[PDB]
Amino acid sequence: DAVFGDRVRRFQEFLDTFTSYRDSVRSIQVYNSNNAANYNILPHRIIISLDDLREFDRSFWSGILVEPAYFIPPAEKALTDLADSMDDVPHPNASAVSSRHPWKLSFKGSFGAHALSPRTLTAQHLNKLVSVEGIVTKTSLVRPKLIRSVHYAAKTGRFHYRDYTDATTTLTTRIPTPAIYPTEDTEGNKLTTEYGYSTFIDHQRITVQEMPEMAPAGQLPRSIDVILDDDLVDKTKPGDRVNVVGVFKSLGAGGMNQSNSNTLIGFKTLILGNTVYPLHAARQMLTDFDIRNINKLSKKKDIFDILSQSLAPSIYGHDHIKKAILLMLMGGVEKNLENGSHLRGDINILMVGDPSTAKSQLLRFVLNTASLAIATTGRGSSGVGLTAAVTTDERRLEAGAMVLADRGVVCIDEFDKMTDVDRVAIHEVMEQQTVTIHTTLNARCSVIAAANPVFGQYDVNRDPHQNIALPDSLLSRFDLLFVVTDDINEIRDRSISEHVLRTHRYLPPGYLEGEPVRPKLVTIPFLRKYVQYAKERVIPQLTQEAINVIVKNYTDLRNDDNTKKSPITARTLETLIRLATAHAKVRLSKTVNKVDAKVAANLLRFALLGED
């Protein structure tokens, strides 16, 4: 109480010591007011550095760690008082005034012993602030709580309100509230619960399994539930790594009660998370300097060539496939017509080659190069599974591998080894960009395919489609078809041997020669940032000249009697337009160049009629 008031004054002194925290509380308030006027309202939750609270008072920070119930509540009350003073709070709603949202407090960084894992969590950590990191598991479905059962006695004119408190929700132990709406008012008039005026905050309690790598062999990883409220609820899902700054709390009788005759059970322990932080372990980050560098790269005479050469630089002989992969990484432009017709924003590429041709290695490199990618092997891949997945769970629908990363590209090894029925399920993804089972899952993902000749060795006498296991319709569904296979030449063999020897001769900076590990090309993260920036800032659109080029290319492909990897089609014309948009996206041009459309049609010609 009085110590709580001293802690409130000390936390206000901490907010005074760090003007950024008070400015952030006032910024949440001002953004809430501006967004309420514009319409998107920021929750009243504040996260501060644990080292910042330590700088304001090491005693206060260690005291919050030792008695979170005693300190964090008063500190959050001080933050809420500062937020109430700073906020204009114009035209507050009666429901908002009833809500009286507290300003939450969280500690960031420099946790040390407070940093913890569920297996390393201890009874001493109970009733003490801590930070726990582990793979999320068995997350509870969001369930609304009740801050207070606001009521209104009939005809009284006064709205009697009954607050409710939960021991998991409140770090301090409390006598349980009735949690029952009063039947009659204290005045004696009949009491009716006031919906709306009553405040309900979403509450979720998610177990967090210890990381499986952190789990000891011969032992199951420990899991500790972390309480979540308001924005913290549904912050993470099972199977996703997360780190939560939450106070472990002893709870329950733990066999001390008379009812538990055996007394074998221990006191229930449930962490109460002040905040939830999802953790990648990804997504590229773009800065202004990198954006200026990307603008210069687009200004380069061959921006697409530079990006493609940067992609899979160690891989040898697959540079044309890498240019096609850059076009696929752009994906082309996706368009939804007023008629409802859909133009795909993804490009599918297929390359056939004998085992150890490193076409599958280039596909794996493409999976690494993509910020998000789907990996499958045709011998182990089912097309029904790629289009959709079924879980016994009533049964719960699961997204297919193609449906997973529905925007991202999917790289498939041994695509020829994948069955033709699997390829039909994949064709639903390739053309319709959606899959129907009666559940329907969107499948607009790009499908880069690593394949092998049906004979296992490509034959020039055999047609490329004959060597490929895929049907001609599947080849037409693919935006591009390639034949990159292992071959034996003397000079090329010396070059490839020198390349493998150069990969072996590459020395990790931390490991010297004899020590195990652990023209310009953009660094792979920078090229991923360039592709993300292309998709984010450039939306290439068809010009008259580029459109005429694509149309003439498709017409000449349909007219020419020369053999093609796939039959020419209006779908091939659409693929040519999409590849033109992809080349222009690499160029960061809002309107596709006619030369860019010709270059994309040249990639399509290398895909169909022969190398181009």
């Binding site: 369930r143 709580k145 009666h438 209006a570």
Partner: protein, 633 residues
């Protein structure tokens, strides 16, 4: 324990404004007060419920602003606490209730007779809800915003509790209608006096002890007896609305939300159609034992106020506009799949299937289906799937399905108590089958059970009346002229006979055709509209389909004799055309029946009161074109 907090709202003045609005508001812009007219209808018992429009409240507030009087912001206070404002609205309706211009038939109302008798014996004697025979409702505010803007289940928040809000999503299920005792009336013989108890909770404890002052004066401990004729009862139904698939985030399952529908609003919904329902989001109290474990955590629900599902003189005017545009059959055919270029004959057959033929039932008991079934057989890349999806979108109740995606039994009726399958969802609609060639013959048998006779047999049975459409690729993925047309169809003769018509389309290279198709496709790509005739709107097209179906043309003597001659000619043409390359299947008396249904559909599209020989010849010409498309090669 109960800290009172004064708020910028006074329920008394707000209710005074509501009572003023009930008498003052009128549909003069649309033109006594309109609300007063509804109150008079309720007094006559011609109206069993009341719906208060939020847009009407906003318009009344705007009128007050024009007059200069400060609006109490009744429309916004509804969004603030609609549940609390509803009681004030009911009280204002009671205050402004006019006398019944029509007799309420009080003698038939046992409650009314006993109410007069109980008042006489007594000389808030009984609950005002028991006195009221109407249910209040709220119409969503007109767009010009939480109530006006529909929400998804995940989009809804706990702060929205106590607020009127519209929601959008698929209705997962609807609970069976159950009685709800709005007021329970208890009677005790010892006193001879009735004691009423108003139940406003999901569960109630019976009084079980006579509260009558007569029993108190006699000192007798009376055993109260509930009377169904005296106790008020209301129909109670629940609905589960699940988030729309687009509203569902990728990798997330849509969440069904329970919704309470009561009174006249009960039984309004059907699971098949998406519904946009405005309702005051409210907490659902937990039971005692479950609440002890839940703690502050609380269940939630929605009480629907206005229900609207996505899918006369105006319809007649629209159909007349289409007729004045003229050539209605070909116009609707070209309107089908305007983005798709060509296949006008297939579109015309699809329009004939949409209109459907007359269903005939003989007096002896024979029933001949009037629903039309069509099949499309085409080479890859001919927009078979695109046209099927467009037709499914054109059909308000039609269902699109794939041969590999769904089992035949699951489409007919999926076993989990029975639940409607894709065909049952296609009731009064068109079940579409993509890649119908890929579908197994075992499931084709289940389809054949329903195509010939609409009913489904499993025991459980459903009428399952629908029109069937199929899209199939030719054997080996593409048509082979060396293969017979029947071989390329690769279908049972029972399926061919049950189908009214099957269309065969071939992919043949052509310079002019490629140029025209590329021009149309490039026009569609550069501009969402097709280059060129203007397709009719889908709503007007469905209205014209319904207007055609209403015609129900009958055959005449000349048309029947001509159809008989055509049947003889077709049987002889099958007998002579046993050559498989030219044989499309033997002549069917049932096929002439299908021909009769197609002629009825054509006369319906022409809105002829009777079937025409021109319609019969047009159906025969549709079949002839189905053969001639392959004959052209």
């Amino acid at each position: 324990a109960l800290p009172s907090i004064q708020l910028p709202v006074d329920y008394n003045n707000l209710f005074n404004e509501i009572t003023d609005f009930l008498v003052t508001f009128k549909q003069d812009t649309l033109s006594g007060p309109k609300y007063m007219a509804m109150l008079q209808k309720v007094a006559n018992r011609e109206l069993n419920s009341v719906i208060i429009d939020l847009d009407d409240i906003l318009q009344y507030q705007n009128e007050k602003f024009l007059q200069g009087t400060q609006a109490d912001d009744l429309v916004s206070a509804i969004q603030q606490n609609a549940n609390h404002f509803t009681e004030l609205f009911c009280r204002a309706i009671d205050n402004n209730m006019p006398l019944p211009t029509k007799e309420i038939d009080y003698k038939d109302d046992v409650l009314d007779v006993i109410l007069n008798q109980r008042r006489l014996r007594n000389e808030e004697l009984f609950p005002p809800n028991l006195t009221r025979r109407y249910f209040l409702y709220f119409k969503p505010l007109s767009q010009n915003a939480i109530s006006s803007k529909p929400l998804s289940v995940r989009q809804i928040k706990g702060d929205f509790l106590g607020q009127l809000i519209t929601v959008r999503g698929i209705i997962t299920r609807v609970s069976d209608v159950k009685p709800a005792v709005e007021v329970i009336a208890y009677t005790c013989d010892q006193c001879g006096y009735e004691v009423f108890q108003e139940v406003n909770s999901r569960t109630f404890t019976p009084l079980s002890e006579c509260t009558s002052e007569e029993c108190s004066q006699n000192q007798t401990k009376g055993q109260l007896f509930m009377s169904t004729r005296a106790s008020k009862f209301s129909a109670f139904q629940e609905c589960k609305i699940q988030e729309l698939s687009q509203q569902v985030p990728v990798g997330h399952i849509p969440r069904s939300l329970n919704i309470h529908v009561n009174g006249t609003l009960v039984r309004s919904l059907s699971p098949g159609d998406i519904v946009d329902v405005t309702g005051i989001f409210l907490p659902a109290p937990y039971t005692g034992f479950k609440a002890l474990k839940a703690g502050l955590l609380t269940e939630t629900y929605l009480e629907a106020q206005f229900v609207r599902q996505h899918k006369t003189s105006d319809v007649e005017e629209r159909v007349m506009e289409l007729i004045t545009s003229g050539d209605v059959y070909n116009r609707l055919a070209k309107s089908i799949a305007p983005e798709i270029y060509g296949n006008l004959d297939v579109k015309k057959a699809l329009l004939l299937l949409l209109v459907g033929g007359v269903d005939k039932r003989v007096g002896d008991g024979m029933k001949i289906r009037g629903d039309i079934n069509v099949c499309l057989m085409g080479d890859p890349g001919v927009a078979k799937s695109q046209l099927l999806k467009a037709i499914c979108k054109i059909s308000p109740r039609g269902v699109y399905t794939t041969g590999k995606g769904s089992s035949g039994v699951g489409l007919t009726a999926a076993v989990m108590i029975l639940e409607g399958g894709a065909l049952v969802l296609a009731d009064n609609g068109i079940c579409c089958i993509d890649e119908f060639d890929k579908m197994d013959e075992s499931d084709r048998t289940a389809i054949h059970e329903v195509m010939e006779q609409q009913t489904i047999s499993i025991n459980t049975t459903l009428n399952a009346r629908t029109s069937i459409l199929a899209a199939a690729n030719p054997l080996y993925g593409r048509y082979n002229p060396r293969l017979s047309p029947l071989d390329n169809i690769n279908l049972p003769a029972a399926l061919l006979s049950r189908f009214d018509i099957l269309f065969l389309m071939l992919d043949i290279p052509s310079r002019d055709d490629d140029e025209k198709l590329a021009e149309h496709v490039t026009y569609v790509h550069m501009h969402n509209k097709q280059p060129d005739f203007t397709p009719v709107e889908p709503s007007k097209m469905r209205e014209y389909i319904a207007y055609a179906k209403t015609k129900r043309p009958v055959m005449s003597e000349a048309v029947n004799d001509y159809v008989v001659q055509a049947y003889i000619r077709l049987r002889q043409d099958s007998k002579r055309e046993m050559d498989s390359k030219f044989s499309f299947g033997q002549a069917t008396p049932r096929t002439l029946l299908g021909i009769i249904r197609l002629s009825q559909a054509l006369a319906k599209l022409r809105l002829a009161d009777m079937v025409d020989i021109d319609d019969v010849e047009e159906a025969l010409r549709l079949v002839r074109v189905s053969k001639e498309s392959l004959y052209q090669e």
